[PDB]
Every structure is written in C-alpha cells, then in structure tokens.
Amino acid sequence: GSSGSSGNRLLSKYDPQKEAELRTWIEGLTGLSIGPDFQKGLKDGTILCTLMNKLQPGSVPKINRSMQNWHQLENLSNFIKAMVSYGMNPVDLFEANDLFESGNMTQVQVSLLALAGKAKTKGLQSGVDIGVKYSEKQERSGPSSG
C-alpha cells in the first residue's frame, strides 16, 4: 500500500493563507469548484469525496449529489473513514458536523493540509521509507445498526 510517508505533525491550527493552498491543490485534483464559502462548498461534501477518490482508487463508493441533510452528511462520513485507510492519524481527522454545521473549521483545514502532504508522494519520486509499521482494521456495511 503506502510505500512511505514523511509524516506531518502539524498541530491543529488555522491560516488565511494556507486555506487557499488546499482548495488550489484540491480543485486541480478533482477539477471541480468549491466556491466562495469554503466551508459551504465543502459542507455538502461533494468535492471532499472526489478529492480522495483521486488519491485512492477505492476510497469512496458513491457521492450523494442531493440537497438533503442525511445525504450531505453521509458524504463527509464516507470521506473521513476513507482518510483513515490512507494512513492518517486518529487526531488528524475531522467530524462531519465540524464542516456541516461549521462545528469546526480548524480541524477540517489541517486534515487536508496533512492528507495532501502525504498524497503528494504519489507524484514526486520516492525511495526507501523511513521504517514504520502500522495497520488498522475496518469494515463497511449498508444499514448501520445505530
């Protein structure tokens, strides 16, 4: 899977200059448009999904292009769980509400800033990894119990 990864430890933070770096790195990846209201454009969780798909050929199953809550939420929930598989940290993630109800715009910002730095590896040619071993388990299901 992941041949190697430098490993970013950027503690939760916010920057009016970095935000642009993300949308600029994501928009080009999927080729979609976020919009004037970052939080919004992503809120629905339309691009956030595709973004991952680009990096991983098996991250998100499908995206809900509907103007409904449950639908919009599922998107974020789908993307997030997908990040964990990529090789992110249990803290470098963000909750669905964080973006949906702007419950947190700092956690979502860093998340991307951390997922990108690692994704880049795809492009730039890399060699022998540092030397870390990690592997978590997981399973997907249709009708969630609760």
CATH superfamily: Calponin-like domain
SS element count, helices: 6
Largest sheet: none
Number of domains: 1
Number of strands: 0
CATH architecture: Orthogonal Bundle
- Amino- and carboxy-terminal Cα gap: 31 Å
The best one-word shape is globular
State Rg. 15 Å
State the CATH class.
Mainly Alpha
List the secondary-structure elements in sequence, H or E.
Answer: HHHHHH
Secondary-structure-derived class: mainly alpha
CATH topology: Actin-binding Protein, T-fimbrin, domain 1
Estimate what percentage of residues fall within beta strands: under 5%
Bin the helical content: 40-55%
Architecture overview:
There is one protein chain. Helices cover 45% and strands 0% of the residues. α1 crosses α3 and α1 crosses α6. The protein has a single domain, classed as Calponin-like domain (Actin-binding Protein, T-fimbrin, domain 1, Orthogonal Bundle), CATH 1.10.418.10. The protein contains 6 helices and no strands. The longest helix is centred in the middle third of the chain and has 18 residues. It has 146 residues and is an all-alpha fold. The PDB classes it as structural protein. Keywords: all alpha helix, structural protein. The assembly is monomeric. The entry is titled "Solution structure of the CH domain of human calponin-2".
